[PDB]
Amino acid sequence: MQHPYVGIWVTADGRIRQELLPNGRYDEARGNRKSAYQGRYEVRGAHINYWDDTGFTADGDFVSANELHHGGMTFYREK
Numbered sequence: 143m144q145h146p147y148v149g150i151w152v153t154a155d156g157r158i159r160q161e162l163l164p165n166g167r168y169d170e171a172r173g174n175r176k177s178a179y180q181g182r183y184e185v186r187g188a189h190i191n192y193w194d195d196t197g198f199t200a201d202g203d204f205v206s207a208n209e210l211h212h213g214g215m216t217f218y219r220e221k
Contacts, residue, residue: 145185151210151217160217168192 146166152159160170162183169180181194183202192200192212202212210217 143184144182147183147185150220152221154216154218156221 144166146164147162148164148166149162150159151162151168158170158172160168162168167180167182170178172178179194179196179198181192181196181198183190183192185204188204190202190204190212192198192202194200200213202210205211208219210219
């Protein structure tokens with residue numbers, strides 16, 4: 143029950159980066175805190191949430207074709 147996407151979603155400043163894996167997953171590397179978090183996501187009508195295996199979960203939604211909105215943040219593709 144998942145739909146991969148793959149893509150390097152980075153902030154507007156470049157303080158943090160989130161790579162969407164080829165296996166339909168995510169991996170974010172923040173400055174001085176790489177490999178901070180990683181898990182999986184479910185896409186529903188542009189709406190996606192991160193359900194980590196370490197007991198965490200996030201939420202977001204694609205507002206554009208290259209823009210991402212999760213946890214109240216703005217992530218751009220590859221950039």
